Amino acid sequence: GLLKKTTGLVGLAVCETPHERLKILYTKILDVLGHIPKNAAYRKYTEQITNEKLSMVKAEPDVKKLEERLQGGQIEEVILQAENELSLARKMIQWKPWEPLVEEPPASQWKWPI
Amino acid sequence: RPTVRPRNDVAHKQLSAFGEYVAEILPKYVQQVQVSCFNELEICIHPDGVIPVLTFLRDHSNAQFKSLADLTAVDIPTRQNRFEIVYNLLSLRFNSRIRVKTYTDELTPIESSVPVYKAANWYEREIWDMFGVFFANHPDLRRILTDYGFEGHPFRKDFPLSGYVELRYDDEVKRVVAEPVELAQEFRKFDLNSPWEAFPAYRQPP
Amino acid sequence: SNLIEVFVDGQSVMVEPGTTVLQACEKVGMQIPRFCYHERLSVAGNCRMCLVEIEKAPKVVAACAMPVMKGWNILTNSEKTKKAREGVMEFLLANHPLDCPICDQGGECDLQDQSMMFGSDRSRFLEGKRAVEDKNIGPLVKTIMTRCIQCTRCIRFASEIAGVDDLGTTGRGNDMQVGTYIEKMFMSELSGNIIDICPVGALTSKPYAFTARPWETRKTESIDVMDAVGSNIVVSTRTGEVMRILPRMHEDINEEWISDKTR
Amino acid sequence: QLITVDEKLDITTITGVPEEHIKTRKARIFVPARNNMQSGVNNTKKWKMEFDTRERWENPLMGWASTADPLSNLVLTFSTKEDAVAFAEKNGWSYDVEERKVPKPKSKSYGANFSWNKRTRVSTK
Amino acid sequence: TSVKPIFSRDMNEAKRRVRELYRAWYREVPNTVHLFQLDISVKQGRDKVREMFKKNAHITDPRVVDLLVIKGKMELEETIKVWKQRTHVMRFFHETEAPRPKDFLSKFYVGHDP
Amino acid sequence: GVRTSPTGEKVTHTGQVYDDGDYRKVRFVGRQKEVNENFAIDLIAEQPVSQVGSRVISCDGGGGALGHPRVYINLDKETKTGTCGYCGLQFRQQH
Amino acid sequence: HQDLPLGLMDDIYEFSKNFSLRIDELEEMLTNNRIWRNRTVDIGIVTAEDALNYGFSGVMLRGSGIQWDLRKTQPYDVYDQVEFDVPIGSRGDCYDRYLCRVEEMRQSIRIISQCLNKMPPGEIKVDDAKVSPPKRAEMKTSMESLIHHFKLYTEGYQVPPGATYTAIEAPKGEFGVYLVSDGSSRPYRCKIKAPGFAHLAGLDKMSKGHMLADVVAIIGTQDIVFGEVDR
Amino acid sequence: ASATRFIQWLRNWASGRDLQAKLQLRYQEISKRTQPPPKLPVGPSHKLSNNYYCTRDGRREAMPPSIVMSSQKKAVSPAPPIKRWELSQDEPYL
Amino acid sequence: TYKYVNLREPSMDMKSVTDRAAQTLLWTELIRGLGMTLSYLFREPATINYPFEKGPLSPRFRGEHALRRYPSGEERCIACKLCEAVCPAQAITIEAEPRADGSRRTTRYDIDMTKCIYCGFCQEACPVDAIVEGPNFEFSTETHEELLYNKEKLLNNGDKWEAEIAANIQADYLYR
Ligand SMILES: CCCCCCCCCCCCCCCCCC(=O)OC[C@H](COP(=O)(O)OCCN)OC(=O)CCCCCCCCCCCCCCCCC
Ligand code: SF4
Ligand code: SF4
Ligand code: SF4
Ligand code: SF4
Numbered sequence A: 001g002l003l004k005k006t007t008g009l010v011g012l013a014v015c016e017t018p019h020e021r022l023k024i025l026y027t028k029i030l031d032v033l034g035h036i037p038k039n040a041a042y043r044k045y046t047e048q049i050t051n052e053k054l055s056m057v058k059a060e061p062d063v064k065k066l067e068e069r070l071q072g073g074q075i076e077e078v079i080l081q082a083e084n085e086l087s088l089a090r091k092m093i094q095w096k097p098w099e100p101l102v103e104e105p106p107a108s109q110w111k112w113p114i
Numbered sequence B: 001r002p003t004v005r006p007r008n009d010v011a012h013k014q015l016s017a018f019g020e021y022v023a024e025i026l027p028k029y030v031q032q033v034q035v036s037c038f039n040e041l042e043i044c045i046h047p048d049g050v051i052p053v054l055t056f057l058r059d060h061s062n063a064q065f066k067s068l069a070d071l072t073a074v075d076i077p078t079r080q081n082r083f084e085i086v087y088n089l090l091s092l093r094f095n096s097r098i099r100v101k102t103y104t105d106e107l108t109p110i111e112s113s114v115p116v117y118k119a120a121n122w123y124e125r126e127i128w129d130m131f132g133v134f135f136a137n138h139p140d141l142r143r144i145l146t147d148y149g150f151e152g153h154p155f156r157k158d159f160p161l162s163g164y165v166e167l168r169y170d171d172e173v174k175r176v177v178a179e180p181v182e183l184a185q186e187f188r189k190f191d192l193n194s195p196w197e198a199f200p201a202y203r204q205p206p
Numbered sequence C: 001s002n003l004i005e006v007f008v009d010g011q012s013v014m015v016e017p018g019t020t021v022l023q024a025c026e027k028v029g030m031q032i033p034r035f036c037y038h039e040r041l042s043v044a045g046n047c048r049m050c051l052v053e054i055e056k057a058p059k060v061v062a063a064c065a066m067p068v069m070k071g072w073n074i075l076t077n078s079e080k081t082k083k084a085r086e087g088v089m090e091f092l093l094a095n096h097p098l099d100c101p102i103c104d105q106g107g108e109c110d111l112q113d114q115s116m117m118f119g120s121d122r123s124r125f126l127e128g129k130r131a132v133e134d135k136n137i138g139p140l141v142k143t144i145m146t147r148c149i150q151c152t153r154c155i156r157f158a159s160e161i162a163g164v165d166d167l168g169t170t171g172r173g174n175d176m177q178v179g180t181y182i183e184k185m186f187m188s189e190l191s192g193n194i195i196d197i198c199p200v201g202a203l204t205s206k207p208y209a210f211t212a213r214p215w216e217t218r219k220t221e222s223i224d225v226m227d228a229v230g231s232n233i234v235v236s237t238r239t240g241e242v243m244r245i246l247p248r249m250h251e252d253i254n255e256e257w258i259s260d261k262t263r
Numbered sequence D: 001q002l003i004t005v006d007e008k009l010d011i012t013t014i015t016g017v018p019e020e021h022i023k024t025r026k027a028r029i030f031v032p033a034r035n036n037m038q039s040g041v042n043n044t045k046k047w048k049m050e051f052d053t054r055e056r057w058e059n060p061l062m063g064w065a066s067t068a069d070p071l072s073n074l075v076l077t078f079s080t081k082e083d084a085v086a087f088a089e090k091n092g093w094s095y096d097v098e099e100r101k102v103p104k105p106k107s108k109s110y111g112a113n114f115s116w117n118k119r120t121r122v123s124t125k
Numbered sequence E: 001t002s003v004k005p006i007f008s009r010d011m012n013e014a015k016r017r018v019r020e021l022y023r024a025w026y027r028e029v030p031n032t033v034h035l036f037q038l039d040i041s042v043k044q045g046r047d048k049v050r051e052m053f054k055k056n057a058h059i060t061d062p063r064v065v066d067l068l069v070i071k072g073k074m075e076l077e078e079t080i081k082v083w084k085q086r087t088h089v090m091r092f093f094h095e096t097e098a099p100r101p102k103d104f105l106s107k108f109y110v111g112h113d114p
Numbered sequence F: 001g002v003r004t005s006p007t008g009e010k011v012t013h014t015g016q017v018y019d020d021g022d023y024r025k026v027r028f029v030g031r032q033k034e035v036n037e038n039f040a041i042d043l044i045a046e047q048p049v050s051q052v053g054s055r056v057i058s059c060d061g062g063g064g065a066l067g068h069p070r071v072y073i074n075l076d077k078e079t080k081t082g083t084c085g086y087c088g089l090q091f092r093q094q095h
Numbered sequence G: 001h002q003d004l005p006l007g008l009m010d011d012i013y014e015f016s017k018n019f020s021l022r023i024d025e026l027e028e029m030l031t032n033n034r035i036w037r038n039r040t041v042d043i044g045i046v047t048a049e050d051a052l053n054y055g056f057s058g059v060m061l062r063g064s065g066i067q068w069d070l071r072k073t074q075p076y077d078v079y080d081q082v083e084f085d086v087p088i089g090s091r092g093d094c095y096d097r098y099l100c101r102v103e104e105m106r107q108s109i110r111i112i113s114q115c116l117n118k119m120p121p122g123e124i125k126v127d128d129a130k131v132s133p134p135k136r137a138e139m140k141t142s143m144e145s146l147i148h149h150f151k152l153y154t155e156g157y158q159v160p161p162g163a164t165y166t167a168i169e170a171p172k173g174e175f176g177v178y179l180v181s182d183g184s185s186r187p188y189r190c191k192i193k194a195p196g197f198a199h200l201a202g203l204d205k206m207s208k209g210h211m212l213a214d215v216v217a218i219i220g221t222q223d224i225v226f227g228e229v230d231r
Numbered sequence H: 001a002s003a004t005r006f007i008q009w010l011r012n013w014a015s016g017r018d019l020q021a022k023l024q025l026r027y028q029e030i031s032k033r034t035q036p037p038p039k040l041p042v043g044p045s046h047k048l049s050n051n052y053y054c055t056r057d058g059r060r061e062a063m064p065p066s067i068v069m070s071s072q073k074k075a076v077s078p079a080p081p082i083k084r085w086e087l088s089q090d091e092p093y094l
Numbered sequence I: 001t002y003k004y005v006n007l008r009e010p011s012m013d014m015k016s017v018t019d020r021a022a023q024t025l026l027w028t029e030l031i032r033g034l035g036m037t038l039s040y041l042f043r044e045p046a047t048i049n050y051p052f053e054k055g056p057l058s059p060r061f062r063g064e065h066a067l068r069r070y071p072s073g074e075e076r077c078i079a080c081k082l083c084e085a086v087c088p089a090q091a092i093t094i095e096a097e098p099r100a101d102g103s104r105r106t107t108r109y110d111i112d113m114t115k116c117i118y119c120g121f122c123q124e125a126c127p128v129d130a131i132v133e134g135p136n137f138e139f140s141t142e143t144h145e146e147l148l149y150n151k152e153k154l155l156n157n158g159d160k161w162e163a164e165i166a167a168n169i170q171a172d173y174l175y176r
């Protein structure tokens, strides 16, 4: 399991400890998700995919074989996606998009052709 | 069948499933979801949901729509909210496209999506320029395509094709001047629509 | 109470007894293609463009003439209906002349438009075509009778609306010809309306000949002042010039006719 | 947070239209009449808004039709007359509304062509 | 009849912005006349500014007022940053346009328009 | 078939000519009025009537796909000739 | 509109056979020239994340290492039947984008070679005369063909109502149209997505920390034509 | 093609290539400017039977969009994740 | 499938380092660039001797418009207005009436050559090969007005160029 010299994507640094970084990030996500109601679809779906990713990380110490399991590109791309999810989860708490529809559209709003 | 475009049921089902997925996760904002017969997915949302919905699609691990392909408006004068705001997004991770649509009128601001996509900057300036839709919290909202001091929003359906003013150089004042438009040959309007219906599948109820 | 229930492509509609299949379809916004049928003339049933399948009935019915029965499901878009329309259109065009560029009907022709919408997109007619000699019926209506499709609208209008029994059909079969038989002028104060109701360019306005195409005209809805009836009209103009006058439907005044002076 | 506005919607000041082409124009709101040359009715489904016709003159060089009317070609389409009226009102145009003319239901009977004692009997087919 | 505001929640707040915009325009005219080397006087430029404001004095919708101020600020920015050229500034004055007659008789003699 | 007016201006095949008081003829001063002198109405009239042995004849203008759409001309009347609506050639049923 | 004239394919082959040498001469002047490298290396660096979020496409993406090309990922007419390589940069700078474009020319010749060999017989427009006009010989003999010719060149074909965003890998990047049909024969709306619009919007970002003469290089590396930016 | 042997040698040496094999000026290898007439084939719809337009009418098979939700379980992605590209074997590196 | 355009490690052995120092100090790559421009000096140029020589064109070339006749001299145009309808630029203006002999013919046929986009759609639309784009491309003028063609100008163009137009049509009509 040698460390790669480059991710090949400009600005995306190589990560020396991908497994620790991912375990920390996925655990953080599940922590933030605990603050969302239990019946919110965002929580149920995000907890489900996050847990599957966390199980893969724990079941594969080889980085290249882990990358193939996750199907998310470079492990550093997978870490970046995890950071994006963690940032999204914190925004979702303020937005609360699991609440009912704010307002129906006018009668013919989405009718095409007129 | 050589002349007929082949259907793709597999992609139609996948996009339909993802459309429900989005609607279930953001019920607060999603008003309608549909998949066209050529397999394009459209999410119709309340305008309040521009930032939450676009952020979700950009950042969620099962979406990852990292690229804003295009952002534009359509003017439909018969609608109370005449302007339809269309976001076209691309996900490289899942090799997919999605279209997000909302609406506004002439006096209701839309939230600028520059925080979600830096690409939105100029697209929203163009929408303001051509349609007159105001975007709130834009870093620098001003005309982009029309002349300086140009009055009106040309892409509105009630703006005349040739405009109201035209330019020429006037020797007396030694500068280019703007004057009301007169055309040596008026644009010739054609009435092309056949009085016979073409597409039964889209007939509207009486 | 009196109304009976029928179905148009599965959509229930309540219609009065005596309503034809074609009228039932028009209740749900479906216009059946037609040539010989005109709602202000007596029913003829000869062009056969209106043939439509009735569900669970092996034979297509002429929708313009067939009274609708209770519980019928009219399939206006079935494969059987479409093939019936394609076949009839094919027969209509087999002897029709390749005249569209020189024919004043071009651009507002029901034969052209229903060929586009309901017919096939090509020909398999490998023979020579019929050619018919032209009739002289006065200074207002030009006849190019090779374009006639024998719909008999003009005959029915002349007999029933104008009360003039001068137009008819002579001969038989493929050689059947619409005209006056003898040299004779169709001078009636309503004669010019046969230009409008002729679906093809067989009867055309002589004064209007060759001067304009329909797509380039501007339509100004207006009123006639040649008498005190107040007939509603459309003034066609192009590039600042009046080009012709057309009837504008008004049920309580002129219906869809105008007098020759108005025209 | 929403606010309350009771003013009649008026956007004439923010559309950029020259004042002449608001105050002096007369919009016509109507359903187009069927072209009498054809039986198709598909062009009579929607409402239209057009403006009053103004001068066209002959171009001295070529004889082409010249115009100084920027709205000479403007024709707008609406689902209902209420939508058309609402659009006209907020844009400051005075308008005329013509009620839609719909052909009345006719009573047709092929059998009447052969009546035993009525004038509807036809002399030819 | 409950609507999303632009900037102003009512006419009083809207009219504050109008006054602020007018002050900015009023102070900018002398610089504009000098910078664009205009042949009009500072008084003419300010008389034109007042005329442009005055024609919108009948507006009572705070959202319309906000848009007018927004558009007025854009026009002021184009002038201060000299994105406009001399031709653009002078278009407000219609120097080459002949006097359009107003009374009924004058319009009757020249053409058909009202 | 070019004819000239009293003022001297050539008359076109569409009958156009500026009348005596028309200022617009100033455009030709020092230049010229472009007029095509091969009047098609006079040229087609020189073509002989074609004698045929059938009631119906077809014309495509000559040259197959290089001509005009093929039309069929009825020749039952003996008072006049059958004229092609596209190219103006005339036909007559012999005997 | 028309089939290839006889003999054209031979001349395209003759042109293609010699063209890679012309690229070689272009590379001899620029690729290793220290002055050219000084003007382009480490100029206008864009990171992969910034490129995506700023709406870049084409070489503006691949120069920064992103593995994306619509001919491969979302293929059209027959791009799935030809073989070629996508050039990818590593530095995200003007020099890498120059190299990507030069290599894409080589791959274009490689594709052209395959198109010449696999060109099939048959008609060149849809055999459906309610969309594509009939052949002139048919228009001048058959009634149906003449009607359809007349109608196709006056009214045009009606397009069923709907909206599509369609894009291709144009030479400058992703070029798309958001086309809205109202059912008639005229489009209701046609928004043109021009790749150079987003690219030029990123000039200020890319010009950070560079000198005036580098702005010329960065504008060039974006490949900007104002016909499509301004529309 | 008219260059002398010396001048051909000089420019081949300066460029480093066999320029004469791939001249950028065209000579007789180009196709004749007069060609025999073509005879183009016809498409699949050129048949005299079994050819009803309603069986090949693509425009009329278009349908309005399917409304999957209107304001009136495993997570899914819009499509399966994209497959990693493979490095070219023709020439992986320049 | 993809390739890397610029992903290579320079060799850091003494021979390779000294190779790059010699390139830096002796300007070898710049001298190699001088070699290529030197070889072009001794190539035959590609310039043609216009107007004595002309660039090659094909029968399909879209140039100056002309109105054509039948062999009898009758005009082909029967005022169908298909060309006017299709013209993307609205460059064509047509009026028509019955001719004195009853023929359907134009009284006006104008092409504004400064509106025209030389797209050829008119000659595709024409059912009788009446309006064509001819082979002439050398018709620049000193005034704007000279480029506003009326029917007399276009008929004169047809009579002027018919010899070449017919031959060009003869070469391409089987592709149409
Ligand atoms: C025994 C004891 C002896 C002791 C003495 C021994 C001395 C011999 C060994 C030393 C050799 C010295 C070479 C002197 C030439 C100057 C060398 C030089 O300066 O080259 C470096 C210069 C910049 O190099 P650069 O790639 O930018 O990177 C360096 C910065 N990091 O790169 C450049 O300058 C490039 C030049 C740019 C201009 C290009 C246009 C000119 C190209 C054509 C020139 C043709 C040759 C000129 C011949 C003139 C003849 C009159
Ligand atoms: S009647 Fe219609 S189909 Fe027949 S020639 Fe005239 S335009 Fe063409
Ligand atoms: S002349 Fe016209 S209306 Fe009369 S039968 Fe013939 S096609 Fe019908
Ligand atoms: S070439 Fe094109 S633009 Fe010019 S007249 Fe013909 S159709 Fe119109
Ligand atoms: S040039 Fe051809 S298409 Fe144009 S009006 Fe004349 S005949 Fe018709």
Ligand code: FES
Binding pocket: C033, C034, C035, C036, C037, C044, C045, C046, C047, C048, C049, C050, C051, C062, C063, C064, C065
């Ligand atoms: S419309 Fe029914 S048979 Fe003619």
Ligand SMILES: [K+]
Binding pocket: C105, C194, C195, C196, C197, C198, C199, C200, C201, C202, C203, C204
């Ligand atoms: K008619």
Ligand SMILES: [Zn+2]
Binding pocket: F059, F060, F061, F062, F068, F084, F085, F086, F087, F088, F089
């Ligand atoms: Zn002929």
